[PDB]
Antibody, heavy 216, light 214 residues
Framework: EIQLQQSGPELVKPGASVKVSCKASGYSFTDYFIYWVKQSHGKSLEWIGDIDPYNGDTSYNQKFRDKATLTVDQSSTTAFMHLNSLTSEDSAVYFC??????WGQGTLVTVSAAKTTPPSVYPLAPGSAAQTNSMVTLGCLVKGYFPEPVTVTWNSGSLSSGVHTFPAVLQSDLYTLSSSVTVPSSTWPSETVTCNVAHPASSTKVDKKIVPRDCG | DIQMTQSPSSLSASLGERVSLTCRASQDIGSKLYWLQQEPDGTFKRLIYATSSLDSGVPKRFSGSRSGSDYSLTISSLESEDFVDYYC?????????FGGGTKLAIKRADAAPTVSIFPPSSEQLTSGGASVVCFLNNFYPKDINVKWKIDGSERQNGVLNSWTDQDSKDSTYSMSSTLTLTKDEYERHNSYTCEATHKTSTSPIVKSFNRNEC
């Protein structure tokens, strides 16, 4: 089968450069043009350029001529996209493709000046005794970390239903997110509820127990 | 460059329903249009080439057509795997350009948010900060607005919102809203209110707490 296998995620500072590889297999590499595509925001798509592998001939979106440089290696049957002078605007998922028909899996590129920072985890307990249909919603607030991702669990994965972990927002180079869990009033606070927050990039794992603070 | 305006940008429908997505070309693109499908893991696949030709192994419920400058992808009878993203692409003239996309979402009964408000934790206060968080959970349809009020006065600054994708199990959406202040400015005021206005009522859902109450 035809495969296009791209290299892993890149995390670099502004002004740095990056070089993404695209390994092609299951057809004659030089017979088809390789295309490169930018996806911003997780949706919007832009053609960057394409390359003829038989000769080295390239063609660029004028928007990307001073940004991208496309090359190949006939032996490794691999196409490359080198991106220079990186800015925040360059953060995206970049795809290679045979024509615009068969697609690589994409490569996440993130550009940021931020240093690795594990999150602060704060418990979110209701301020009052009020119930709604014998349910309590509890939460944790995961604030000021870099880079993505964090993973949140509740009771070490024991509480999996009624959970919403929200996408992170960026404030001032750092990320924040929240997680809610809803359980019966009869289970909390008679039973402990704890959020578990792992941050692979700093190899930290933090627990925060939700402690009642209402007064009946 | 050629602009491909794609509509709708999202569409609610249900299993068995028939739907259509459209791309309008700003210049004659002839029959040179691809329809692409994208899976949630980011995997792209081509469904249609040359406006109306189905790729090998694409189910027959998919068709492409054209009228004047409008190009459409029709799904005659939706299946569960169909509720993903779709993009047109023109290759008549370089630079090749894409429509902005359509996400197909699952139709369900309207549902009001369960709204919850949370005072800043004492751990955060101790560090000099004060985030007030409001969850607006399990509502349908997707559109919703939140207003913060401090001592009855509307507050816009320092508010950050985040929206989940449609729940895979119950097809609802959720929102979180966080108002961040310094400890000092949090302690100058007393009533913190989160107001949620959703299609399921003319009357907003109001949750508050007072700084010193339990």
């Amino acid at each position: 089968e035809i495969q296009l296998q791209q290299s892993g995620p890149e995390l670099v500072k502004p002004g740095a450069s990056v070089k993404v590889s695209c390994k092609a297999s299951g057809y004659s590499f030089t017979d088809y043009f390789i295309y490169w595509v930018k996806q911003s925001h997780g949706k919007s798509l832009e053609w960057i350029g394409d390359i003829d592998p038989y000769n080295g001939d390239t063609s660029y979106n004028q928007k990307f001529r001073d940004k991208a440089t496309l090359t190949v290696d006939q032996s490794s049957t691999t196409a490359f996209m080198h991106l220079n002078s990186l800015t925040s605007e360059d953060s995206a998922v970049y795809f290679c493709a045979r024509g615009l028909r068969f697609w690589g899996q994409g490569t996440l590129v993130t550009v940021s000046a931020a240093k690795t920072t594990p999150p602060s985890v704060y418990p979110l307990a209701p301020g009052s005794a009020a119930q709604t249909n014998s349910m309590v919603t509890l939460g944790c607030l995961v604030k000021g970390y870099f880079p993505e991702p964090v993973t949140v669990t509740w009771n070490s994965g024991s509480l999996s239903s009624g959970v919403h972990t929200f996408p992170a927002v960026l404030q001032s180079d750092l990320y924040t997110l929240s997680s809610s869990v809803t359980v019966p009033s009869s289970t909390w606070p008679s039973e402990t509820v704890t959020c578990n927050v792992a941050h692979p990039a700093s190899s930290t794992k933090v627990d925060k127990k939700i402690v009642p603070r209402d007064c009946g | 460059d050629i602009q491909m305006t794609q509509s709708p940008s999202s569409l609610s429908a249900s299993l068995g329903e028939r739907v259509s997505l459209t791309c309008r070309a700003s210049q004659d693109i002839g029959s040179k249009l691809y329809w692409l499908q994208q899976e949630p893991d980011g995997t792209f696949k081509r469904l249609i080439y040359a406006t109306s030709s189905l790729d090998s192994g694409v189910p027959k419920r998919f068709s492409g057509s054209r009228s004047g400058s409008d190009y459409s992808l029709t799904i005659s009878s939706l299946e569960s795997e169909d509720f993903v993203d779709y993009y047109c692409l023109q290759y008549a003239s370089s630079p090749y350009t894409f429509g902005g996309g359509t996400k197909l979402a699952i139709k369900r009964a309207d549902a009001a948010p369960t709204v919850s408000i949370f005072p800043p934790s004492s751990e955060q206060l101790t560090s000099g900060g004060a985030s007030v968080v409001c969850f607006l959970n399990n509502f349908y349809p997707k559109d919703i607005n939140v207003k913060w009020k401090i001592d009855g006065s509307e507050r816009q600054n320092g508010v950050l919102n985040s929206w989940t994708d449609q729940d895979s199990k119950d097809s609802t959406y959720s929102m979180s809203s966080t108002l961040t202040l310094t400890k000092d400015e949090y302690e100058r005021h007393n009533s913190y209110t989160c107001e949620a206005t959703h299609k399921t009522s003319t009357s907003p859902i109001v949750k508050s707490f007072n700084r010193n109450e339990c």
